[PDB]
Design a protein around this motif. Structure first.
Motif, PDB file in Angstrom:
ATOM      1  N   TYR A 230     -32.606  -9.086  33.649  1.00  0.00           N
ATOM      2  CA  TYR A 230     -32.400  -8.732  35.058  1.00  0.00           C
ATOM      3  C   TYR A 230     -32.206 -10.008  35.865  1.00  0.00           C
ATOM      4  O   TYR A 230     -32.931 -10.980  35.701  1.00  0.00           O
ATOM      5  CB  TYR A 230     -33.525  -7.840  35.637  1.00  0.00           C
ATOM      6  CG  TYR A 230     -34.765  -8.608  35.979  1.00  0.00           C
ATOM      7  CD1 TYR A 230     -35.648  -9.005  34.976  1.00  0.00           C
ATOM      8  CD2 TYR A 230     -35.055  -8.950  37.288  1.00  0.00           C
ATOM      9  CE1 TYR A 230     -36.782  -9.718  35.258  1.00  0.00           C
ATOM     10  CE2 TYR A 230     -36.193  -9.683  37.586  1.00  0.00           C
ATOM     11  CZ  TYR A 230     -37.052 -10.065  36.557  1.00  0.00           C
ATOM     12  OH  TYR A 230     -38.188 -10.791  36.814  1.00  0.00           O
TER      13      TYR A 230
ATOM     14  N   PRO B 254     -40.702  -7.219  27.924  1.00  0.00           N
ATOM     15  CA  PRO B 254     -40.164  -7.316  29.284  1.00  0.00           C
ATOM     16  C   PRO B 254     -38.837  -8.055  29.315  1.00  0.00           C
ATOM     17  O   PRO B 254     -38.646  -9.021  28.588  1.00  0.00           O
ATOM     18  CB  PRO B 254     -41.239  -8.106  30.055  1.00  0.00           C
ATOM     19  CG  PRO B 254     -42.435  -8.224  29.101  1.00  0.00           C
ATOM     20  CD  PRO B 254     -41.863  -8.096  27.713  1.00  0.00           C
ATOM     21  N   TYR B 255     -37.925  -7.589  30.155  1.00  0.00           N
ATOM     22  CA  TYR B 255     -36.597  -8.166  30.228  1.00  0.00           C
ATOM     23  C   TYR B 255     -36.720  -9.636  30.509  1.00  0.00           C
ATOM     24  O   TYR B 255     -37.671 -10.066  31.148  1.00  0.00           O
ATOM     25  CB  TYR B 255     -35.821  -7.516  31.369  1.00  0.00           C
ATOM     26  CG  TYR B 255     -35.072  -6.290  30.957  1.00  0.00           C
ATOM     27  CD1 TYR B 255     -35.585  -5.441  29.998  1.00  0.00           C
ATOM     28  CD2 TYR B 255     -33.851  -5.986  31.521  1.00  0.00           C
ATOM     29  CE1 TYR B 255     -34.898  -4.333  29.606  1.00  0.00           C
ATOM     30  CE2 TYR B 255     -33.147  -4.878  31.132  1.00  0.00           C
ATOM     31  CZ  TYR B 255     -33.670  -4.047  30.173  1.00  0.00           C
ATOM     32  OH  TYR B 255     -32.971  -2.920  29.766  1.00  0.00           O
ATOM     33  N   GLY B 256     -35.752 -10.418  30.062  1.00  0.00           N
ATOM     34  CA  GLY B 256     -35.667 -11.810  30.500  1.00  0.00           C
ATOM     35  C   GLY B 256     -35.165 -11.900  31.926  1.00  0.00           C
ATOM     36  O   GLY B 256     -34.463 -11.024  32.412  1.00  0.00           O
TER      37      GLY B 256
ATOM     38  N   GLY C 140     -39.815 -13.133  33.663  1.00  0.00           N
ATOM     39  CA  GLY C 140     -39.833 -12.085  32.638  1.00  0.00           C
ATOM     40  C   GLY C 140     -41.187 -12.089  31.948  1.00  0.00           C
ATOM     41  O   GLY C 140     -41.546 -11.134  31.250  1.00  0.00           O
TER      42      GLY C 140
ATOM     43  N   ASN D 142     -38.815 -18.392  34.606  1.00  0.00           N
ATOM     44  CA  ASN D 142     -38.590 -17.067  33.970  1.00  0.00           C
ATOM     45  C   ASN D 142     -39.715 -16.066  34.281  1.00  0.00           C
ATOM     46  O   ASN D 142     -40.720 -16.020  33.552  1.00  0.00           O
ATOM     47  CB  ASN D 142     -38.414 -17.161  32.451  1.00  0.00           C
ATOM     48  CG  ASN D 142     -37.798 -15.878  31.844  1.00  0.00           C
ATOM     49  OD1 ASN D 142     -37.829 -14.788  32.432  1.00  0.00           O
ATOM     50  ND2 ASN D 142     -37.231 -16.022  30.660  1.00  0.00           N
TER      51      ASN D 142
END
Ligand SMILES: Nc1ncnc2c1ncn2[C@@H]1O[C@H](COP(=O)(O)O)[C@@H](O)[C@H]1O
Ligand SMILES: Nc1ncnc2c1ncn2[C@@H]1O[C@H](COP(=O)(O)O)[C@@H](O)[C@H]1O
Ligand SMILES: Nc1ncnc2c1ncn2[C@@H]1O[C@H](COP(=O)(O)O)[C@@H](O)[C@H]1O
Ligand SMILES: Nc1ncnc2c1ncn2[C@@H]1O[C@H](COP(=O)(O)O)[C@@H](O)[C@H]1O
Ligand SMILES: O=P(O)(O)OC[C@H]1O[C@](O)(CO)[C@@H](O)[C@@H]1O
Ligand SMILES: O=P(O)(O)OC[C@H]1O[C@](O)(CO)[C@@H](O)[C@@H]1O
Ligand SMILES: O=P(O)(O)OC[C@H]1O[C@](O)(CO)[C@@H](O)[C@@H]1O
Ligand SMILES: O=P(O)(O)OC[C@H]1O[C@](O)(CO)[C@@H](O)[C@@H]1O
Ligand SMILES: [Mn+2]
Ligand SMILES: [Mn+2]
Ligand SMILES: [Mn+2]
Ligand SMILES: [Mn+2]
Ligand SMILES: [Mn+2]
Ligand SMILES: [Mn+2]
Ligand SMILES: [Mn+2]
Ligand SMILES: [Mn+2]
Lengths: 326, 326, 326, 326
Positions: free
Chosen positions: A200, A230-232, B205, B203
């Motif tokens: 995202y 979890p998305y990067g 994430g 990051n």
């Protein structure tokens, strides 16, 4: 094997063209090659700095903005292909002079990514093209068409490499610039985006200004409820770069409406719509959160809109949130 | 006006050098120019793809990794200047052969930013250099010195332009590569970082894996308590790019320890320490959260560490949090 | 200001073309840019050496011959513009395949100046183009037209710079290649040759094989009878270079019949006729000594002819000698 | 494999140098790379034309003369390596300022081949280097040493490719410039000239002004008395090009004394002596007709001399004629 020139002509031939869509595109390429050469040594040309003005849209204008702008205005003109130009840098539509005029309208961000120039991050050029509707003397109106009217759209990325990505009715193709011979060599033919990615991309500096859906959505990327990973997170800062990474790796890019920008930041004509067209042509989506971007009849040439785009499944997951809430 | 070559020699002359620190540096430049040429057309050279292996550190190795690696190993060797090389790509220290050997140890990330290759985002090369201590036959130990022993450190950014940033005892200088004549032209002399910026780079994430200080800190960037404006968010994905933007715009870059990486992700020898040295030489800081990076006596050549760096005031604001908590 | 592309299109537009003369020319340019890039570093590409064969015409074939040949055969093909190709390197006419076929015949020396490759002297590419006459299935005959049937002719010089010189019904224009952006920028518009120069250019290694007119003529250049100053002597060794210097400085270039080559050395189709067309279009002449070159109906595609060309007054002074004698 | 830089250093290392001969040479290379870049697009930079003056030696000075001159004066200066410079363009010796001064004297033709610029024929740069003898404050005298005192000599050819040829005590090596990465890559190691060739190279526009030996010699090349084949004739017009072709193909190059130039045309300091040194180092000869060039103690820095050079057997055949006659 295949140069942009060649590919241009072979695809424009099969569509039975006049060569006019062609001249135009090739003119655009030279523009891109020129911009790209300057950018690769812009500091050695003292092209970092300000040119000294504010945009119609608000931007603190840099010399690169200027150079690259002039170039496109020039090359589009001499093409005999266009009649109306809309530039980020230009307050009013530009009406080509009658002898040099063609049947095309061209909207463009001559250099997208100004906040990223000085620090040498990726930047680029975005453009869209519509065929003229009116028989009216060409006016600013011939630009105020929705995105579903686009005949061609793409952008150039001056990233680690210089890439020219181009979408038309039949799909998206990437061409890379070989500095050595100054040609654009097809690198990816008829590109498609993944149905779902894991990145995202958003300026979370507006966490506070964001609406309830964006907020809920981000939280889900960080705290996956199916307990998946979890998305990067990625956010280069340059629309052209983030859109492109979204293109090839999948995932989602976001510049949503916020409590301060009822209408987001990015411009409809020359940032949003072309990126949307590319993106839909690759098989992903592009929404305000509330409606497709390409269906929005603009009323102002410098108008903004929110924009969610990328992997269809992701973009959908979030459209659902926007629903869940409104 | 000034080429890297010239600047090299004039600064190495005044320090009374043997020319050996010199040969070395110039060898490095050629390496950089070569890598940069390939990168600017890596897709046209089929250099995106995998080379087919995993690192000592875990990385899924790309061909560019390889090419660029060989090049540096080559050029450092032929320089007659070095005795031990530590590469990201290489499990064990590399001991130069006796006739080609010099009194220098060189650690390097031959191509930093692998996750960013395919999508054409910025990537780069990072390197550090220490003078040999031991009289021991040169071993892997001569690399296991802390960062405060560095005599030279820098990195090359293949961003929108190709930049070579270089720090030594006396300060940081940026040189840009003019593709046209293949030289590095000084663009910024003796650079300094702002005492405070307005960009946090991380990051997110790993929001969930993060510790209480990082968490508190980010929240403060997004919800400023002096009700000032919230910092902008940036995270290119490429250490070299984010560090550099931090350098010229100010702000902070973060790759902290998390519940999974007691010791963060980035490597001490060839990502962390050189970036720290550059950064301290510009007037900013570089901490694990708990201790300066440059004071850490490594025990393993591929060892990782957390890393907070950038504007001194920011880095401090967060060191305070780490205190507030531990 | 003006790129070859632009100039092409604007001149082809005013003539009301189909765009086919165009595609063709632009295809040719890419060919030239590619050849030129290789040549500028041919030794670094191990392109000096032999490829391993003899021509239809007798030449000891070099790799550059080959590469550059393939390239043109390729690019002319993909243009959709041509139907018959005649190459120096190819024994028989090449008949384009039906789907890729156009209405054009193209004769070319892919790399003129082989004796000059290894020593890095100037070399080039020469080409001519005729419109197809026959309704016959395209055969080798469609090439056997005289020079007065040429619709376009020119050549590229890879000299100290890379130049693309191009003649059509309306005149001669020179475009130089800017390596930096890979475009050909108009340098000289509608060029004309001086009515008389002061340079004679000839291989006097054949003093002994020469006829009485050439002999008398040379003696007059060296012992001017109006006691004026004697002409300068020049002979690069590369037809493209000598013709070009003749073009811009005036004077005369000579490769006459001799006791051994009843018909001189240079080939009618792809060295002689295009050079003659260019030259007449600039306002100079081109003769066998006995007849205009452009009026000679070839019977064989690899046939040779003598050739005198350059400043009209000079070429005339010598036609007179040829008369005085025969 | 091998860059000029590398080769420089490895050969200068084995000779135990200070690095000063080195800095100098590398400075020279940058100069060459810069000149070469400009030349490859000099017409696109409006560098054809006159700069507006006459030389100490008589030349109608072109802008390229100027640019390229400044560059060398610049780069030699900043090298810290030289103390006296002699340029074709400069009336008087140039005495480096004391802080930038080194122990070297450098004579150079910044751009040899002016008559060949406009027509895009090959041109180049020639240079020689002597170690300072005097303890005198460096004066113009430190240049007035004979050719047998040269420590280094070479020249750059901007021909179809850009070549850097370099001779020192131990032999001649050719390096070609790869525009792509801006480095000079060794192409020929320790070059030797053929004992006899078959090319004579001379401006026969002076047939009438020539002496009895030159006359007899040429006649022998054209009417071989052993009834062998007659030598080929070549004369590019550019000393650097003809000397070089002589180097790699063998044969002879000639610019002899004539009834008008008791002392030939070419200058001793910066055309003749370096070309002679190169040439003798390859195993050929270089004579006035009456004495080796390298043994001539100059009295004037802009002084001319005749010059015969090339294949030893040829040069000898003609020395014999000069004897036969005087
Ligand atoms: N090079 C091309 N590639 C794809 N479609 C083309 C091309 N040229 C023309 N066309 C199609 O034909 C229409 C008109 O072409 P033109 O006559 O060149 O303006 C355009 O709207 C295109 O959809
Ligand atoms: N080009 C240079 N720039 C700055 N310092 C240098 C340079 N060359 C040598 N030195 C200093 O002198 C030390 C030894 O130089 P060297 O004898 O070349 O190994 C190095 O550790 C440097 O601190
Ligand atoms: N780019 C051009 N420049 C000059 N003349 C052209 C051009 N294109 C076409 N023509 C003229 O029109 C004829 C046919 O054009 P085409 O229909 O493209 O084959 C040619 O023989 C040319 O004389
Ligand atoms: N790079 C080099 N190649 C060959 N010889 C060199 C080099 N550098 C120095 N020398 C020799 O050593 C002498 C003095 O070197 P330097 O101390 O650098 O002036 C010169 O006259 C050369 O003959
Ligand atoms: O600086 P922000 O608020 O993160 O917005 C960044 C956006 O600005 C732009 O530079 C255009 O304003 C885009 O390229 C980019 O997506
Ligand atoms: O992918 P992540 O977890 O955001 O980490 C990115 C980091 O990885 C690197 O590519 C090195 O692994 C750095 O350049 C960059 O900072
Ligand atoms: O080698 P000669 O006999 O002087 O002929 C040279 C001619 O040969 C060519 O290379 C073609 O054979 C021409 O470019 C040039 O004019
Ligand atoms: O023009 P000429 O008399 O043939 O002399 C040519 C000579 O002139 C030079 O340009 C130097 O004057 C040399 O490069 C070349 O050999
Ligand atoms: Mn813009
Ligand atoms: Mn933009
Ligand atoms: Mn790496
Ligand atoms: Mn890395
Ligand atoms: Mn040929
Ligand atoms: Mn030829
Ligand atoms: Mn000169
Ligand atoms: Mn000269």
């Amino acid at each position: 094997i295949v140069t942009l020139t060649r590919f241009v002509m072979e695809e424009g031939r099969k569509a039975r063209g006049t060569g006019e869509m062609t001249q135009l595109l090739n003119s655009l390429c030279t523009a891109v090659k020129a911009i790209s050469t300057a950018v690769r040594k812009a500091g050695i040309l003292h092209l970092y700095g300000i040119a000294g003005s504010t945009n119609v849209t608000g931007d603190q204008v840099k010399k690169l903005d200027v150079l690259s702008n002039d170039l496109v205005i020039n090359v589009l003109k001499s093409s005999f292909a266009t009649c109306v130009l809309v530039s980020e840098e230009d307050k009013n539509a530009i009406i080509v002079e009658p002898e040099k005029r063609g049947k095309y309208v061209v909207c463009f961000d001559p250099l997208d990514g100004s906040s990223n120039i000085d620090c040498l991050v990726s930047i680029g050029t975005i453009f869209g093209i519509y065929r003229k509707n009116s028989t009216d003397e060409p006016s600013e109106k011939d630009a105020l068409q929705p995105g579903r009217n686009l005949v061609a759209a793409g952008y150039a990325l001056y990233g680690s490499a210089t890439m020219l990505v181009l979408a038309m009715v039949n799909g998206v193709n990437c061409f890379m610039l070989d500095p050595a011979i100054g040609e654009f060599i097809l690198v990816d033919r008829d590109v498609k985006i993944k149905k779902k990615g894991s990145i995202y991309s958003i300026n979370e500096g507006y966490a506070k200004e964001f609406d309830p859906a964006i907020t809920e959505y981000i939280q889900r990327k960080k705290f996956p409820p199916d307990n998946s990973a979890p998305y990067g997170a990625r956010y280069v800062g340059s629309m052209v770069a983030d859109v492109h990474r979204t293109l090839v790796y999948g995932g989602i890019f976001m510049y949503p409406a916020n409590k301060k920008s009822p209408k987001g930041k990015l411009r409809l004509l020359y940032e949003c719509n072309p990126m949307a067209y590319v993106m839909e042509k690759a098989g992903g989506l592009a929404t305000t959160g509330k409606e497709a971007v390409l269906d929005i009849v603009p009323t102002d040439i410098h108008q903004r809109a929110p924009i969610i785009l990328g992997s269809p499944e992701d973009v959908t997951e979030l459209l659902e949130i926007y629903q869940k809430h409104a």
